[PDB]
């Protein structure tokens, strides 16, 4: 069972080499998710730092884990960074990031005081969905179902 230092080591290895351990026969993205989420509950600051590094990396083959990193930020004290990242990157966020974003706001509808939504973000997200909805990989993120939940939560906005 890893210390926070070892989880951090594994995450820096994943970012630099594409694996958490050279001789782990697991999918390294699965190893990276274990490391990232184990870090997050032990060391919030460090956990959210590596969420940010994962979103900004240009050298990561994993797609699911970019969703994870986005999702942990959305549900943290640093939600605003995630709102800003989405606004700035909507044009090219992945399937996984789009689904987390759409799901987050679907849920947010039930909050008594939801966070202020940046101007134009919902329109951007919808546009990006139209760009990605025919991707044959979309169904593994239940993108279409999550889009319907989102649009049904914001119908005047449709």
């Amino acid at each position: 069972v890893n210390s926070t230092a070892k989880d951090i080591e594994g995450l820096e290895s994943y970012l630099a080499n594409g694996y958490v351990e050279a001789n782990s026969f697991n999918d390294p993205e699965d190893d990276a998710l274990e490391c990232l989420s184990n870090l997050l509950v032990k060391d919030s600051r460090g956990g959210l730092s590596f969420c940010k590094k994962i979103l900004n990396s240009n050298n990561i083959d994993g797609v699911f884990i970019k969703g994870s990193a986005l999702n942990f930020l959305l549900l943290s004290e640093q939600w605003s960074y995630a709102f800003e990242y989405l606004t700035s990157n909507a044009d090219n966020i992945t399937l996984a990031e789009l689904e987390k974003a759409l799901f987050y706001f679907y849920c947010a509808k039930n909050e008594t005081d939801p966070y202020p939504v940046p101007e134009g973000l919902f329109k951007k997200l919808m546009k990006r969905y139209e760009e990605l909805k025919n991707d044959p990989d979309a169904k593994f993120y239940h993108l279409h179902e999550t889009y319907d939940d989102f649009s049904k939560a914001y119908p005047l906005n449709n």
Binding site: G18, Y19, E34, V41, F72, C107, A108, P136, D137, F140
Partner: protein
């Protein structure tokens, strides 16, 4: 033109049967995990635990968000279910094409995977091959880990490109 089957140890010293060809490697267990719908875990109980978390978050997201152990569990469960659904989908794809689950078919698939990996550098860790069956052809997609010695170890096989 052949591949070799030997046993190689992982980071904890545990040996894994592995198919080797040139500078590429496939732990043979990957066939069950990713291609034949025997990914790890029990789908029904996993989905039941994920659903109760998802429903808690949908109804009270702020309160759910306060304890990151919630996000941690839900996301880990989500990836396990996601890996199972991709693997069952791959099994469905091979079955539809008549590529039944036999030693020869699985050897065929691995040999072609190993061939596709021979070039791979850190500049591109993804390959794909066409496998042939009694009910037509299908493209399958693999991602690879580049090891410090430059050889490749299969990470995943999926029915769709990601």
């Amino acid at each position: 033109n052949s591949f070799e089957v030997s046993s190689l140890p992982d980071a904890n010293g545990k040996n894994h049967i592995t198919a080797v060809k040139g500078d590429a490697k496939i732990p043979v267990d990957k066939i069950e995990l990713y291609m034949r719908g025997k990914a790890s875990g029990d789908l029904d109980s996993l989905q039941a635990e994920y659903n109760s978390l998802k429903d808690a978050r949908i109804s009270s997201q702020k309160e759910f968000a306060k304890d990151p152990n919630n996000a941690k569990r839900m996301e880990v469960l989500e990836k396990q279910i996601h890996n199972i659904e991709r693997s069952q989908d791959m099994a469905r794809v091979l079955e539809q094409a008549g590529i039944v689950n036999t030693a020869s078919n699985n050897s065929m698939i691995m040999d072609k995977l190993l061939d596709s990996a021979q070039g791979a550098t850190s500049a591109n860790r993804k390959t794909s091959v066409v496998v042939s069956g009694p009910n037509g052809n299908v493209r399958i997609y693999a991602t690879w880990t580049i090891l410090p010695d430059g050889t490749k170890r299969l990470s995943t096989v999926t029915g769709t490109f990601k």
